[PDB]
Amino acid sequence: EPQVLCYLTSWSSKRPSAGRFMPENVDPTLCTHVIYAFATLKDHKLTEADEKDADMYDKVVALREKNPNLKILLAIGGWAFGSTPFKELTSNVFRMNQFVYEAIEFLRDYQFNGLDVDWEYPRGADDRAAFVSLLKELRLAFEGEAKTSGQPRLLLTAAVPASFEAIAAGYDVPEISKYLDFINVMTYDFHGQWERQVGHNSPLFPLESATSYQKKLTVDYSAREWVRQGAPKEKLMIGMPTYGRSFTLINDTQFDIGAPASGGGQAGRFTNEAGFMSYYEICEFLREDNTTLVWDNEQMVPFAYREDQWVGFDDERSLKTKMAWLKEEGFGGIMVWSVDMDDFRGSCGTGKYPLITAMKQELSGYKVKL
Ligand SMILES: CC(=O)N[C@@H]1[C@@H](O)[C@H](O[C@@H]2O[C@H](CO)[C@@H](O[C@@H]3O[C@H](CO)[C@@H](O)[C@H](O)[C@H]3NC(C)=O)[C@H](O)[C@H]2NC(C)=O)[C@@H](CO)O[C@H]1O
Ligand SMILES: *[C@@H]1O[C@H](CO)[C@@H](O)[C@H](O)[C@H]1NC(C)=O
Ligand SMILES: *[C@@H]1O[C@H](CO)[C@@H](O)[C@H](O)[C@H]1NC(C)=O
C-alpha cells in the first residue's frame, strides 16, 4: 500500500513552450494523489489565487475520469505565502472555524478529495498551538461533515520541513500526527543559492568528512528525526525532488562539494529562476560539452558541472537508492515535487516521466508493515 503524492504547480502552465504543463499532461496511473499548488487566502477564506485557476481546478479534478481511485487535493500555503497569512487566520476561533466550514464548501464544490496545508513555517510556542488548533478543527470538521453528509471524509495532509531545527521550532509531532492523514516531509532544499558554498539539494546520507551538524542535513537523518519525534511511519511521505539546485562557481577549478559559489547558476530556459533547474532542463545541461557527471558514492546522489556551472540533482539511480532505503526503513510512501518538473515529454532520451516511473517500479511489490 505505498502512497505516491504528487504536487502539481499551477504556474507551470505559464511556462514557455515545451515547458508548459497542463493537468492534461498528468499521467493518471502515476500517482495515487495529485496535490494542486497553490490556492490562497482572501479575507481568511480559502479561495482561488487567480480567476484563471477556477477552470484549472476543474481539469486537475476529472483526472479521476481516467482513474476513479485517484485522489485530487487542493494545497494552500507555500514558500511565498509566508507565515503571516496563517498567523492571522489563526488568531480568532471564529475566523478559523469559518474558514474551516467554508473551505469544506469550497472543496466539496470543486469535487476535491481533501486539503493540503503548507504553512512555511510555524515558529515559536504560540505558532505551534495554532498549527495544532488548525489541523484539529479541519480534521474534526471533516470527520463531522462525513457524519452529517453521506460522503467519504475529506483528506487532510500537510507539507512539513526536514530540518531538525525547524521540526522543534514549530511542530508538535505527536499531536499533528493524530489529525493528519499524510505527513509530507519536504526532504529537499538542504542546500541552495542562499549559500556561498556548493552543496547538494537532497543527499541521502552525509559525507564522512562532514561536521555533526552537516551530518543532520540529509534525507536519512531528517526522516528518522520525524520518527524520533513521534510521527507514525505509515503516515510519513518522504519528499522526492524532480529538480536540482544549481550554483555559479567562484572558481571553475573547485567543483567538489564545499567549493565557493557567488550565487545561483544560470536559470533554466523554462523554469526562469536561478539556483534551480527542472530535470528536463538538467538533461539538456548534461548533453552540453565538457559537462562532467559525478556520482557521490557517500551521499548516493549525482551532480554535474560545466565551466562555472554546477548542479546537484536526483536521477533514476539516486531515487532508486532512496526507494531501497525507504522500504528498509518502512515508510508509508513518497511525496514528489513536482510532477511538472519531471521529464513528462520524455525528451531526456529515457521514457516519459523517467524519475517518478523509476521510483514507482522500485516501490513495486512493497507493503507497509511493522
Ligand atoms: C511542498 C513544497 O514543496 N513546498 C515548497 C514550495 O513552495 C517550493 O516551491 C517553490 O514555490 C514558490 C511559490 O511558493 C515558487 O515561486 C514561484 O516561482 C515562479 C517561477 O520561479 C514564479 O513565476 C511564481 O511567481 C512563484 N509562484 C507563485 C505563483 O507565487 C518557487 O519557484 C518554487 N520552487 C520550486 C523549486 O519549484 C519548493 C522549493 O522552494 O518546495 C518547498 O519549499
Ligand atoms: C582556482 O583554484 C585554484 C586552486 O584549486 C587556485 O590555485 C586558482 O588561483 C583559482 N583560480 C583563480 C583565477 O584564482
Ligand atoms: C572535460 O575535460 C576533461 C579534462 O579535464 C576530460 O576528461 C573530459 O572528457 C572533458 N569532457 C567531458 C564531456 O567530460
Describe it for me?
With 370 residues, this protein is α/β, with parallel strands linked by helices. It has one domain: Alpha-Beta Barrel (TIM Barrel). It contains 10 helices and 15 strands. It has helices at 53-60, 84-88, 93-110, 125-148, 164-170, 173-179, 219-228, 279-286, 316-329, 354-362; strands at residues 3-9, 33-42, 45-47, 71-77, 114-118, 155-161, 182-186, 236-241, 243-249, 261-263, 277-278, 292-296, 301-306, 309-312, 333-337. An 8-stranded parallel barrel has the order 1-2-4-5-6-7-8-15. α3 crosses α4 (125-148) and α9 (316-329) packs parallel to α10 (354-362). The longest helix has 24 residues, at 125-148. The radius of gyration is 20 Å and the shape is globular. The structure holds a molecule of 3 linked components (NAG-NAG-NAG) and 2-acetamido-2-deoxy-beta-D-glucopyranose (2 copies). One 2-acetamido-2-deoxy-beta-D-glucopyranose binds at residues 251, 253-254. Belongs to the glycosyl hydrolase 18 family. Chitinase class II subfamily. Disulfide bonds join 6-31, 283-348. Residues 2-366 form the GH18 domain.
Q: Which characteristics define this entry?
A:
370 residues, alpha/beta, TIM Barrel, eight-stranded parallel β-barrel, six-stranded antiparallel beta sheet, 10 helices, binds a molecule of 3 linked components (NAG-NAG-NAG), binds 2-acetamido-2-deoxy-beta-D-glucopyranose
